[PDB]
Write a protein that binds this DNA or RNA. Structure first.
Lengths: 253, 147, 247, 129
RNA sequence: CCUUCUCAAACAUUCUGUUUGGUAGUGAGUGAUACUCUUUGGAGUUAACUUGAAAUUGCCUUAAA
């Protein structure tokens, strides 16, 4: 953690040297391991835990920008007859956010075809959530151009309960996924970079005890051996080296 | 369908609400001759279809020129009963697409581009060339045996 | 002439069906090998539909049953693939508007699930079986002539007393019993029965018959749905009622 | 003058060399058909070439199907001048991956990483931080 | 001129809570620095930006006639 604070302070130094502007200061973390899942690709995103969500500052941080932070929900093609928008307006501002556009799965196959219009719709959006029963079908209705990004991907939420729709469940999970979780994918190869955010947003005095838990959780999952830090330009900082993982490369075969 | 939407608005005008604003916007073709000539020179028509067989031809003989003038995508179609089918008359003599739904914007754009490439360009000769100087059968065989 | 749109659409639909069969076959084989950790769903389902239509969904847990299959056509572009053509040509189910019996058991579930979008399945009553038996159903024979590439209608019960007397089967009511009870192996009986041939529902192209055709296609499109989901249950409509119009 | 070779573009999806040949052989007898494809996970690059025999089948095909509009991409097809001799676009296949390794005993790579730690440290030293 | 994989089980009660598993694409081009293996064979991943699905040659038959 002394290494954590010193590396973050020196990256602050690195950005304090006297589009591109918002781009050049995004903090990202790199992690690698032995080898990932062979000949297979994954599309599910795992939402790590956090104590200080970075989604919640992003509202007031992007309100004053041009990227125009917005939200999408994809419900099943049966609950747009049940869940109105004023219900969410009421139940959500009492917490601090709002879901804006409810797009039925049919509007992906009727009005948002013709990829020009599809992308013209998709770029407008920042936080995307998907019915758990349609997320399995969304790669055909939205295309890999959306998957090529970390935030445009559809994020599965447990809309269904035992039993039927019960928008109370949608509510009681959307909070857990806006102010309690943090999404990231799992690709092939070894390297994975996580978007922690910009040095305009939430502070290092919480980034420390945030990276602590992100480490403590991921370090046990995939037998990882290398964790570094950078911000969009900087040389890689060695913050982790475990040789007690490279031992099974000559034990697998 | 007219009487059914009238019954629905009849219900809603007093019970819940309607100022003829409970039912959504309607989208349909425009098929009157006076109406479509007045819809050009506005200008709102997006594609004009003109039947090619009107017996008093001088009714439509002037529409292509005004269309090219005001810059409207005209196209001349084979048959006026064919037009009347999509209007629920017997003959209609013109039809116009003025406003389309959301899902059909790409369809209408590609279609007007097709009409551009196939009608506007394939026919630069049409302005000249009086047509119809065709001989009969016996007269033709006569001239072709002579020369 | 060919009119390229047809050959393009046939290719597209055929690729869809190809990869759907690929999906369901690989999933079934991966369930069969029981390395079941990287899977999709645990058990299998069956979906019953009654008359804008009420539905159910329940596990199988076989417990075999006596199913009736009737061949249908479509959908509309699919150059039938090899693995489905094989199953149909084994069940003697070429030439649609025809009907076959089958002993539904636990191991046939990986076959009807492949062939789902080409047949219609049902568990009918005793009336349907008996009336089908005594109205249709044919037998191939041989005696005194007739080198027997040729069938007949089933007038006689002595023909049965001959060709099945080893199993004590006489008087085709006994065969009706064997079917409706899944009795003495059911298999010699089914391969005797010479799978049936039912008449179409609408024969037409007048003026009133195009209306019956339109209504039939619209009701079919409403009720019979094809999933392409690689996990879909098999659908059960009322064949007790279907055979009224198809018999 | 022109060749016997014809070139097509803006093809739709699912309209590959098989159906291209089957359809365009309705204008004569064709010599060869080639379509463009990708190197990894071969998918259609939406253009290709054909050539039958005669210098007139090409013009017949062009005059017939130059602005033809099938599934919603209107086609485009040109005749080529003398020669130009189609050369390329071999038909590929999806690139399945195979793990190349591991062969080297972990010890020399362990030394590699024990060096690379300070190598990174000097790289950031000169950067410098 | 077809039309898109739109829930599975378990452990639990707080009137819904938690763990698991399920997702291979429109092509083309622009483009910043970082890693993992392997001999030189360059493979797997990595901040994000453009386009009217845009384009020229990368070694079963009564769904008939």
């Amino acid at each position: 953690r002394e290494r954590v604070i010193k590396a973050v302070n020196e990256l602050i130094k690195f950005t304090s040297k006297p589009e591109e502007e918002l781009k050049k200061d995004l903090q990202l973390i790199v992690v690698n391991n032995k080898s990932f899942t062979g000949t297979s690709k994954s599309f599910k995103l795992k939402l790590l835990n956090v104590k200080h969500s970075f989604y919640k500052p992003w509202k007031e941080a992007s309100a004053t920008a041009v990227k125009d932070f917005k939200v999408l929900l994809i419900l099943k093609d049966s609950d747009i007859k049940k869940v109105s928008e004023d219900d969410l307006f009421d139940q959500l501002d009492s917490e601090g956010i709002k879901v804006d556009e409810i797009i039925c799965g049919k509007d992906l196959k009727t009005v948002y075809k013709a990829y020009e219009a599809r992308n013209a719709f998709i770029s407008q959006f920042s936080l995307i959530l998907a019915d758990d029963s349609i997320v399995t079908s969304l790669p055909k209705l939205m295309g890999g151009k959306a998957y090529n990004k970390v935030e445009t991907t559809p994020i599965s939420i447990r809309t269904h309960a035992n039993k039927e729709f019960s928008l109370t469940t949608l509510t009681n999970n959307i909070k857990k996924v806006y102010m309690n979780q943090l999404p990231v994918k799992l690709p092939r190869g070894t390297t994975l970079n996580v978007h922690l955010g910009n040095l305009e947003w939430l502070r290092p005095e919480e980034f420390v005890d945030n990276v602590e838990l992100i480490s403590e959780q991921l370090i046990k999952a995939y037998q990882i051996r290398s964790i570094f830090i950078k911000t969009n330009r900087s040389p890689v900082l060695p913050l982790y080296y475990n040789q007690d993982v490279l031992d099974e490369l000559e034990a697998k075969k | 369908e007219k009487k059914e939407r009238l019954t629905k608005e009849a219900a809603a005008v007093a019970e819940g609400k309607s100022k003829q604003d409970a039912s959504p916007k309607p989208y349909a073709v425009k098929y009157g001759l006076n109406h479509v000539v007045a819809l050009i020179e506005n200008k709102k028509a997006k594609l004009v279809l003109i039947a090619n067989d009107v017996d008093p031809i001088e009714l439509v003989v002037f529409l292509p020129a005004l269309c090219k003038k005001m810059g409207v995508p005209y196209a001349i179609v084979k048959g006026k009963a064919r037009l009347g089918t999509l209007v629920n008359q017997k003959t209609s003599a013109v039809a116009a697409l003025t406003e389309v739904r959301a899902e059909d914007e790409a369809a209408l754009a590609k279609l007007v581009s097709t009409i551009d490439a196939n009608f506007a360009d394939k026919y630069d000769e049409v302005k000249k060339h009086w047509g119809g100087g065709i001989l009969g059968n016996k007269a033709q065989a006569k001239m072709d045996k002579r020369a | 002439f060919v009119r390229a749109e047809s050959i393009v659409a046939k290719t597209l639909a055929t690729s869809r069906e190809k990869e759907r069969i690929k999906r369901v076959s690989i999933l079934e084989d991966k369930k069969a090998k029981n390395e079941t950790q990287h899977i999709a769903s645990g058990k299998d389902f069956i979906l019953k539909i009654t008359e804008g239509l009420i539905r159910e969904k329940t596990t199988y847990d076989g417990k075999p049953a006596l199913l009736f299959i009737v061949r249908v056509r479509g959908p509309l572009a699919v150059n039938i693939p090899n693995k489905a053509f094989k199953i149909l040509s084994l069940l003697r189910l070429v030439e649609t508007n025809t009907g076959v019996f089958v002993k539904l058991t636990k191991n046939v579930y990986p076959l009807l699930k492949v062939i789902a979008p080409y047949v219609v399945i049902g568990k009918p009553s005793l009336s349907s079986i008996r009336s089908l038996i005594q109205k249709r159903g044919r037998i191939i024979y041989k005696g005194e002539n007739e080198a027997e590439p040729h069938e007949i209608v089933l007038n006689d019960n002595n023909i049965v007393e001959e060709q099945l007397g080893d199993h004590g089967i006489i008087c085709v009511e006994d065969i009706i019993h064997e079917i409706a009870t899944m009795g003495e192996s059911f298999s010699v009986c089914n391969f005797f029965l010479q799978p049936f041939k039912l008449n179409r529902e609408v024969s037409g192209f007048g003026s009133l018959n195009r209306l019956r055709k339109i209504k039939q296609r619209e009701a079919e499109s409403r009720t019979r749905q094809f999933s392409n989901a690689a996990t879909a249950p098999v659908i059960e409509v009322d064949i007790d009622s279907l055979l009224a119009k198809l018999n | 003058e022109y060749s016997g070779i014809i070139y097509v573009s803006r093809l739709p999806h699912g309209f590959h060399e098989k159906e291209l040949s089957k359809y365009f052989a309705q204008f004569g007898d064709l010599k060869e058909v080639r379509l463009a494809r990708n190197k990894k996970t071969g998918n259609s690059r939406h253009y290709g070439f054909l050539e039958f025999v005669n210098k007139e089948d090409a013009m017949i095909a062009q005059e017939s199907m130059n602005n033809y509009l099938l599934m919603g991409h209107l086609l485009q097809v040109r005749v080529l001048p003398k020669g130009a001799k189609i050369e390329k676009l071999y038909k590929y296949k999806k690139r399945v991956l195979v793990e190349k390794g591991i062969t080297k005993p972990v010890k020399q790579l362990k030394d590699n990483m024990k060096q690379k730690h300070e190598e990174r440290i000097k790289k950031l030293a000169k950067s410098g931080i």
